[model samples]
Target: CPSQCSCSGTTVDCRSKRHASVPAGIPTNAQILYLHDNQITKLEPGVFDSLINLKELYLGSNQLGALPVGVFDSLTQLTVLDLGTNQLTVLPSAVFDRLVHLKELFMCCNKLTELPRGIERLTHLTHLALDQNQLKSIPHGAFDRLSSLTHAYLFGNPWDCECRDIMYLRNWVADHTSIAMRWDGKAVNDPDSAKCAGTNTPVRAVTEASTSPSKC
Candidate 1:
């Protein structure tokens, strides 16, 4: 048995171990792994190559500042991933391209200035948390492929509401009534501090009332 880890069959419980790095000797067959509230700062490439059956992974509240490229390429069966409350600034575009089975992703409270362009590839995603970051803009049609998305959190960031691209985002949200849009824990249509950087107007002022632009 791994020193501080508790294991049951293929699930490993290593939460709050306070280890400075990913503990060695994790069971090779681990399908659900919990490493939340640890001090892990970085994940070396291929660290998880053997855990091919991994389904749920929790790395929230860690010190992870960045992920090595292809770090999660082997986790094709992953469904729920928790990376919230970390220090990540950027993610590689292809980091999540292979997670076609991923359903829920938690990325709140990071230093991310932008989301990876490949985010739209998660066609099965239903819950996404992006609150509390440093985001300034989102690519047009970024969420168009998220056909199954139901709950999306987009508050607590510096959104550049005056940019023309903001219109595309607004229309996307407006058109998707199936997805409940939220900012700062409230409906996206409601008023809040999500304002335009250049014009200082509330984001909802334009998002809720503007007509669809002829050109995104």
Candidate 2:
């Protein structure tokens, strides 16, 4: 493989290659591709346009600043995507719209300021990580469409406690426990630092004590 990327049947390991961008010549029939721990600064559109059979793609610990829209449109079979430990601040509204089968998504340690617009479309997603981001609050009914979700990571974010927009996140977090706290084997356990700003109130408590929860 070019750039010395190891290829084994349908799997590709291009990890820690020190390449400033995704290397070329990755096999078309590849099912799992590892591009993590590299120096990837930006992903050009149409880069992964042919890996239609891709099920898992790991791009963690890269230097990606933003994602181009429709970049993953062809990977309909993708189940896991890792985008953690990067510099992404915003994502195109339709970026994840095509990953219908995606189950685990990692957005840990980024600079995101808001939720991706069409994230609710992934009906099969079960785990998501948003740790160490710049998020403040989640919009109303954002996660309602993701009924299949069981765990969401929110620790290390600046969670604002506005009752109206905060109702969904607070209620959702109360019902789920694996929000960046994967340490306790998720058996008991911010993973609890999800607190309000001024009053320093717990995220869930802020909703319950909403002075009586809304602009709704």
Candidate 3:
């Protein structure tokens, strides 16, 4: 057991340590690791290679600017990953390829400009938070494979209301009654509420009459 962290059987409690990086000497068999509220700016590759049984990982409220490729490859059993409130600018397209069991992903309050296309591989994801980013548009078929998705947050983005791809996303969410859309923390039941801030035009209104080519 590391002196900086408290170990209780298979759980490691290291929250609010203000550590600049992930602490070493963590038990390889840990199932839950809490490293929130730290100053970790970078993650070395294979840092989590020994935590194969890890199920829940909390890395929110950090200063991480980016993640190393394959950083989470060993966490195949991870179900919940919280990466909110960070300084991340880009995520590798295949960074999440190994997280096959991921269910809930929290990426709110980041600097992400676009989502990795490989995000569609999270087939088991039910809840996703992409609010408070610099996103302008999403890949047309980005959420098509999210069959289990029930809730999605996309309000804080600078969405282009006139973009055909954004229209497709609006229609996709509208067609799926099981999926609830939220913008800037407010429930968006009416399609008009998701209108572009610059033009005040609803995505539905433009898509209804426009024959612009889809940009998926």
TM-score of each: 0.85, 0.88, 0.87
> Please, what are the lDDT tens digits per residue for candidate 2 over residues 153-193?
67667877754667778777776645424324352244355
lDDT of model 2 at residue 203? 75
Specify the highest-lDDT model's number.
Answer: 2
Q: Looking at candidate 3, what is the lDDT of residue 181?
A: 64
**Cα lDDT, model 1, residue 177:** 44
- The residue ranges of model 3 lying beyond 4 angstroms of the native Cα positions read 181-195, 199-206, 210-216
For all candidates, the clash counts are 0, 1, 0
Q: 1 or 2: which has the higher TM-score?
A: 2
Question: What 10-residue stretch in candidate 2 is worst by lDDT?
Answer: 180-189
Candidate 2 vs candidate 3: the TM-score winner is: 2
**After superposition, which runs of candidate 1 have C-alpha atoms over 4 Å from their true positions?**
181-202, 207-216
Q: Which pairs of residues clash in candidate 2, taking residues 3 or more apart in a chain or in different chains?
A: 181-191
